[model samples]
Target chain A: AKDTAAGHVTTPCTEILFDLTLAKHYENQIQAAESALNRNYAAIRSWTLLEAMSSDGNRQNAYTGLIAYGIQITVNAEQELQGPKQTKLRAAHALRHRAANLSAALQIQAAQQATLTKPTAGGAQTPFSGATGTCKYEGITATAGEQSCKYSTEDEEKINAAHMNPEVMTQITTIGDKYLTTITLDAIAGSKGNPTQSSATYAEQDCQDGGNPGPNFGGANALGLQVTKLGTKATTEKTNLYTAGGTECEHQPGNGPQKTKQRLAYLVCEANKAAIITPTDLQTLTLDALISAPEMAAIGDALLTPATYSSAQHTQIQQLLKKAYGQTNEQFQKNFIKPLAAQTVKFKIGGAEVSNTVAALMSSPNSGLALAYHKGKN
Target chain B: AKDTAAGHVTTPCTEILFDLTLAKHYENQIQAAESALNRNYAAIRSWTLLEAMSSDGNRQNAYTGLIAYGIQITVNAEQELQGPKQTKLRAAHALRHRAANLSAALQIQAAQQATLTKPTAGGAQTPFSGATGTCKYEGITATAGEQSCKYSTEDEEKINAAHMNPEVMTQITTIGDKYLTTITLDAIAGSKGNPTQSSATYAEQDCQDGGNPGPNFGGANALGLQVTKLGTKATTEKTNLYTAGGTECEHQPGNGPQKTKQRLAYLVCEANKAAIITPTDLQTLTLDALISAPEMAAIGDALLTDETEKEYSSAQHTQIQQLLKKAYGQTNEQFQKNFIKPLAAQTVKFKIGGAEVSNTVAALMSSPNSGLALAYHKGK
Candidate 1:
């Protein structure tokens, strides 16, 4: 797309780091943390509801605390706390203890397909660098000269496990399960159907300032990875991170750019490299495309060491990613064309949607790029 | 004034909040808690230094807690912290605290203006409702129905003191003593003397960022209102916020906004509101002129309130005071030609030598009409 007034747009990571202010980047990240915590909050509420019906005073106080956790810790995490990463990391650490008490398991993934110990030993920095309390399990080893090394806590691990585990997965599979049925569904219903709430309120707020819209509390395109393993789009019955259904692990299957549903995180992680690694279209591959292809996986994996990367290099990469997909076009159109499209209607091209997409892209690994991510969205 | 293709050309606050996602309006009182904090950051450094400062490990680490403070709280003290007010109210508390530590007497100013308070008797609800924490430091009576309404630990007390303190009045006289003689002087000398640590770096960063020229970090315009109690030009001799020589207060034999003056923190505080209150010509008022109005004394007084006045009866007094002086101008030229035109070469509109003003009605308030803010570059 031609450059518009906001300056040359780049990829998703770029959008994440540079679209707004540093505070904003943190705000988006914090929202994700808040949403995650809120999701956990909902889980707590659901559990509490099973024991008792309405919001009783004590439970109400605890619920208020949970809500405050969303506010004081999550929403306001970036501003008044240590920082977004630190606050989220701490919250996550707190979450692990809480989750463990509730018997929730965390799913764990890292770039480079590194083993749990290898990547953590390699110094893979969790998004929250300061969350190295008891909750922090292990992470990638730090290369020499990298001072900002960190690792994901058990809370993050638990969150991941809860989302991806088979039994919990089954919970989501049945129509009544919260993940598929209630969490998001109820959230939508609660937001829209709550007696006091109204579409009008969302619409009014939407008009006032375009709200962040998407499935995740943070927004749709924040995770930097696909929500679910992509099954083959054609068959619609496969599951895995690599290739949806039977499509090759390399190229995204479908008609055009973005037609193969992909996660913004993977794109950000890759920095806008071609979907097909081998490139049936090229001979040796142009220097640009060649450079772009491998970087996707490499960059996604690099986030495992967000602390080691120089702020300058990280910022540069982020800017590049943001510019790539900042504006809406054929590719963007196809990418977000699901029910997600309706949410996009609530967003503007240059704001949160663009930023979220960039953030999502910056976080994904190569193996999950075209196959798992693409099919998951479709 | 006219709308852009995207929408209304974003006001600085709007740009920072909506487009830039920097600020958020909470309850029609203070700006988004985030924006206020970031604006405080802006007070520390200009856009020129944003990339470098944020990326700098030393700088970044130094401000990690402070940045969090900005993110988590609103800068206002009077607002209730339990409801929607709490979302943005924390920044004001943290910012006031930070301002105190950075300077000499602003700490006192902050102490007096802080709105958060704990109720000891039949008072407002606790300053904090959701969790355990003490915020306000003053007494506030809500009404007969509510058993207790809380505020900052002492927001009303400090706020009242910030406005009415006799000791602060004395201290305001000595504002800018440090910054002008030290930091500003060093910066000017550092630019020409030692290229690496001072001037060259700032200029280089400016050029790298598409070099259209932006606002300056140190000057009368920036220093005014933030650091000083120079009051309005009608009452004081300080010109804008800077302290050089020959100011309205200068007749009483004090300081003025001069080129050679060093920008010290005390000076910034003493002359916070003593900006360019009005132009010599009644028809025109520069951005500098509005800041000088004596009315700022009252405005500064109101800002200290931790909670926005629930009593419309009280706010009515404030509205009347705000109308006393037209702080914002309709056009950038009007702002520059008035407030900036009188400053030294370094302070000239963008220091470019000619005027390139954009069209809009700029606001005196920080977050509301910030879109009207622009770099003034005059080249003949």
Candidate 2:
């Protein structure tokens, strides 16, 4: 007899397709993976702050200056898994105080030396070519300037004296100079004017109307323009603006350049993703205000002083830095300077200072046009 | 003052030349660097030994291996350093143990499993290729064979049973195989050889030897060749002597046919460095015995047990090994069986390895033409 299995439509064998069950589980696991990815990203942000700067010698009065601040940055970024308890924030806060004191000590030590002189011996070059080989002269007096510490501790003076040698100063300068090359600020700036169209929806809109077919309009983007006005604005109309029954606008301490740079970078990264911004924009912004900020300039000048050095006998410190940090000074300026110029036009075009101008520009047809200019790699 | 200056051709110079005292201090520091290099090399060797057969699932393992080893080799080769010292000697010993173990483990693993059976996944394919399902599966066996607790520590089965299926096995195998490709081992080997000549003293000798050079009595060559005797008396004596040492020279113990193969390989590596006496003769004699010995024949049968695997694995293992390691193989007996059988004597006269005379002739030729016959490119 024929095996007659196909008689009268044999019960359609509902073979449990493994993929159907597996795919559902895969999706749930993927969500957890995404959550883990976010957490990991947060951790990476915390760790990379110091890891990136670990090789740098000069940025701190000692190599440890970046270290101290780096630890604080990590602690701040961390969310104690669950909070409302006394967070390790106190420990970090204390660390910040110590770091501040150390910085003061470094300044004092740097100031109280004999004439700072350039080292003739070979020293490791820095990442920033321009920073290498300027001049190294010991400061005549231990006069502390600028930043908070007026009184110095004995430990501070001791640390400074230990490092005040010519050789140590040379090393510090070279290390600091090299770090300047790795600054990534300009790359973060050229991405303003390309924020999301809607806040509620994940979708984003382009700066121009009927521009590229994308998810939405007016997304998160960096302001290509200079910050003409910063800090909280004073308004006359509203009371109890910040808190429950709290009256009037309040002033706040500014976030460090590091946080500001990261937020700006984040926006640019998002804008670039949306296709509203171009690679040219990235090139422009990296060169512009981002790399040329006052903080960065200050950092370049702070690498070597008599206080930071351990041995003041040698003179090769400055030449070593110049040779190792970047190309010659001419090339150094070119690499760093051109980017700043690129973002000037874009800053004006965005009219980004006013919160509402972003929404108003949605209807403009010319908004998508290249408002910014970049000299390098145009 | 003017007359005092006239005594000398040039005025006294104030600028200092390199402070020799300081330079000497740095020269001592270089020795410290060499020690560091050796330690790094040992670390890599030990790491590779532990992990090479473990699986390449985590490429960090391989990456770390290369990084550790690369740093070490770099320090070792940098002539800027003075030379090796007690630290270097310690590191060399540590590295030697790991290196030997690694080679042994690899040999057995390869013998037991074919490269195709090793774990690997198919890479990207185009639309046309994908349509045909051009994905080739590597025969990774961790999915098939658990590290039998019966073979080692019974309680530690979990370590051996890391792979749940063929999928994992394939992933790891690919990692291990791919990693070996990126490493700069060939250049390293060349660095150690006479052609590249690690030290400057051998530089002149290497140049004088050139492309064509004679063995023993004929000419002065950079690589001197050993003397040989002809006729039946020489052949019989050579065979008798080699056969005696062939059995006792134990290397890392392996299963069956693999043991025979490794013993021969060990002799070659050792002989290359002029470490052991009569290294070539030992290799030749051992090679002959491995291919024809009755015990090897049994292991070969076991290797070809599954239909997916055909051919006695001994011959395949030895033959492919020569190319893979970029070294020579056991007495070319299989060559005759596979290649010569179809062709006439005139077509394959020089390449002959008589099936019956396995251990005999190899020992004779090895001693008579030690450097001449065994010496080839070493992938130079």
Candidate 3:
């Protein structure tokens, strides 16, 4: 006798019949596989971080920065992983197709699991009838169509971007500059170089105190003067750290706390070296200011006197300062001024002040020195 | 009293003449300035390196990378630092101009030094005279114009390129990758993970030998069989690594000796994990293989007599390896069959004998099990 199946009893069993149980099983299995993948990824991420945390150079520190940039490029690539025509879905189908023969076996088993409560009962659950829905597994589960799968163009782009992002690479150089300054300053501090003080003071007081020469200062001192001169001296090269090459000092210090501290330390050291004026340098610089002062002519003869020479030198030694009203003198004072604002040295003849200019230079020298320092610090 | 000057007579005798000693002095001063700048630059470079060497990240390591890239962009910026309109020349002019005033003073002194030598001598060096030659300092030195100085555009570009280069930057990312892998793999190994050994052995022996459960064979065993099915599986994902992306699989293991060792270790571990068939999982896998083998019919009636399985299981316990066709086999007589000829496996099965047809399921059984190790190792 021919096997009588439930639902409409179509002839020629070669025709396809959908099995809900098998479809549901495949769906559940796919979901489980996806969950496993997600769990594995999460674990890998945690492990990666744990490994990086104990590594040297704060190597994982780069990961945060790299990932931020990585996400930007990978988004477009990862976007293609879902829905229709995606590699992910296509791979899913391939796995499904591999179990095609099993699906037929599952269909038979599923039909057996669902038996009519009464064989002739009306409206009983049928095997392959009256069910109308989307045929998702038609081409894949039934094995009857051509479907292709591979990494998409977007995936390829993503992989290339992962290798090295050109736009991000451009920014990376800037990052290097930032880290260099920071690491260098930290190294200097660790080695006992006081980056807080003026280069001259750092060289003499803290650095030498610790038996170190401190930073080489390089041409930065002269370069700072050049930077200052460009700022003050009506020249074409008016670029500061901010305005250099029209990049406009767009560099950021750091992405987080440790980097910020390093960045701040580096900037402070740079500013101090650039602007601070020492006493010895100030004495000679004051001559340039003194000559430019409107009061210079009136005091020239008296200040040139033998006693005044010793007295001027003594005053300079005690507190080096000279102030003037003109722009050039202002620039000069701004560059070379220092603070020794409480000392006094008067050029006197026979124990009396020789000129008003002499009194001004000697008695108020310290005050001017202090003001110069205050102004230069800005 | 009539005074004779070399160029002409004037009441206040002012005319130009050449002075070698003063010219030589200015030249010496200029040379000294250049030397000072060069020395300063050299010192800066040294200090920069020293600073970087001790840094936690050796941060200036990036500077070398940055500079390599920076030169590509800044070459144009710094290209203007020489010859006619360059900042270098302009700055040179400023210094030259500063010394120019002194040059005038030197000229006055020099004229004083030579004045009397020609005063009484015939055609002698007068205070000022017809000694016509180039007076570079005439215009430039004493409130004038044309003073020749050098160092061309080529000179500037050369200097800038010497500082850093673009070709070098192009190589830097590769360098970064190179360093990253080495550091990461070293980190992996030092953390007590054996980054050496094939994946099969790694997963089976080392990973599982540590009292840890091995990889869940999940579908990899059956899938390994299906891989053979999929040689006919027909998918475009079959592209090897090089074809997957345009980079052409150019990823190198490492830059040099230390890195190569780390890389080798990593690869070995991966391979071990992928291919090593385990005992517990192997039982089910062997069943699958045994059923598919064509020889299954020949062995089925007798082998199922409880004697063969008991014997087979015991033999497997006695020995795991039986070499055939330049490969190891643990399937005993089943592995040496014409079907299993060149195929190999290393497992706990005893003695080697060949096979013919056993049953409908027997022929394909061992073949799939053996290939699973091969495929999984590739995947790993």
Candidate 4:
């Protein structure tokens, strides 16, 4: 009801990005619980008639009492991972619904804008010119001419397709599925629950550095756009640390005010402005920049030029959607979040729990239909 | 006399890194002065003899008095860029002298360490185990085991070749030459001195985002390194922002203490430890980590494996180097510092300075040798 950090009302796109981060935290909780369920289930399975021969039939009933409890948690774990109600699948569908609609809207706007102005066509000359202006920078009011810049590659069709093209938008959804699945496997789905793994360990693995996921994933400034996107709240130069797949797209020297330089890339990232046309020449030259890092750039790439984008372009205006998110099936599993997918889950074995793994408990020769696969019941 | 930031005393390696930043600052100074000298020189060149032509050669004598003052500042500008006496040449020789000798020492030390303990042969299990320890991390001492990690590709010969191998070590020196040459041209050498290009513009251009040059270049914490390398100054969870060329060599999940994981890389960065061997298992297993970002990794890559390293590899264990530093001739031109090289030189044309560019004054078809090349005389 209140005006929150994202906007007056958070759009589906921002809400989904926020939810993607929340899903990671929930996945971690399920991991700890899943590890406990398997551990206690194994301990119950280890009992034999020789240990408690006197009340063997009656003892079987005691183990069943524990199995009853384990069953509920295991059911919860299954739903958490494979849920239509509240799992990764739900997250993916929400992304498809929101991302696709705005993506289509942006597709139409770029076409209309292209017809009107043909922006970035060989002679658009970016949006600003180098002129002597009194600019207030670094708390010092001083004279500074706006620095000069020109994009090396600026095709109207290419720039538009890189962001909103059907093929490109699909890539992000594919990544959403892959990133979610990978973190789930790396953080939780693993049968090899190591003694050393912790939630922080998963966080470190899932989110690498200031550049990889940078501040986009989970931390104090995750995707930190909500605050900086608003007027006046934009502060002094926060370096664009979006080192997506080891290529740079930062504002180099001679590149003018970063806010104005990166505004096109930033504009596409906002759902409310996805279909919005470019600002007028005078209006476009604002000093405050909404920091556009990897995720913003990745999404921006999907919105722009599917036809002309490639991973090997200059760092000044490079697209990182493919490598950072992964291109084909081969790459999808090894994206930035791949470490989380292949991660060794770390969880402490609790009271009433025994040694062995989730895999081991499920495959024991004795258990059937519950932990083990029942031959006839299948 | 005093143990400062880098170490008990700063190593030549670190001192060089520190000096490299200073060189940039000096170049900025020379840029400002050169802009003035050329501007004033051109104004004096523009003499139509209509306003005050009567004095003639006597007036030439008065202008010569002003030229006498301009000559000294021009000489200073000349010395700064072409300094064997005091400029970029001085910085390069410092790099070559220090980098080469230590590089040789590291080459020998690796052979010895390898002979003593075949470090990454089938088994020397990365110094630490994922076992229980009284570990203190993130301010609160809690129960957590040191995580586990292993290099996907590890070879004793290849690892040693990357850093200290003669060819690999030479690459850094080559970079030292290129990086210096590039910044000189980008920040200073341009004849078209733009009005807007300030010292801050040069800084912003030469230093792009957190991950591009990251914290390796100048600022409140240039190369930051010196303080972070010392004991206890090692704070908690300072994310490695060194994005060399755009590759990732950061500590990922399951990787043990970043200090230990990146220790080998950091060790090579220290000049004192240029000839140092790998630490023993117990010593290596310490929880404290030295943050090693891109530059450290670049030098470490030279020290370790000239044999088996490629640009396209896993992001978890990728080498940023070749692309960041540039490979062969194709890349060197577009290396991270390339923008500064192609940068527009911003300067204020001062009083008594005329309108034409530095190129025009020097090659005016009229001002050939004085501002232009005086035919058997040398070029600045």
lDDT of 2 by residue, B69-184 (tens): 23223322432232323322332332233232222222222222111111111111221111111112211111112111122242223222221211221100001211111101
Per-candidate interface DockQ score: 0.01, 0.01, 0.00, 0.01
Worst 10 residues of 3 chain B by lDDT: B222-231
- How well is each residue in A328-357 modelled by candidate 1, as lDDT tens digits? 334323322221212211111111122122
Q: After superposing candidate 4, which stretches have Cα over 4 Å from the reference?
A: A1-24, A39-43, A46-59, A65-76, A79-378, B1-380
| Model 2: per-residue Cα lDDT at residue A201 | 22
Per lDDT, the best of the predicted structures is: 4
Chain B TM-score (each prediction, in order): 0.15, 0.15, 0.15, 0.22
Residue A204 in model 4: lDDT: 22
- Name the 10 consecutive residues with the lowest summed lDDT in model 2 chain B: B183-192
Ranking 2 against 4 by TM-score, winner: 4
At residue A273, give the lDDT of candidate 3: 24
**lDDT tens string, model 2, A1-378?**
111111111110100111112222223333343344333322222222222223433321222222122222222322222131122222222222223222322222222211211211111112111111111111111122332323235323333323322122110000111111110000000111222222122122112122332222232321110101111111111111122323221221254433212332222222212211001111122323322332222122233321112133123433433332333545434433232232122222122221112112211222111111010001
What DockQ would candidate 2 receive versus the native complex? Answer: 0.01
Per-residue lDDT of B271-298 in model 3, one digit per residue for the tens? 2122211111111223235343322221
Model 4 per-residue lDDT tens digits across residues B1-380: 11121121123233334223323433344445545544533332222111012244333322222222222233233333332223332333343333333322221112110001110111111111111111111110011121122222322222221223211221111112111101000000000111111212123222111222222222211110000010001111112312354233333335565432143222222222112121112111111121122222322232222322233245523443332222211332332122212112212121111112232221231231121111101100
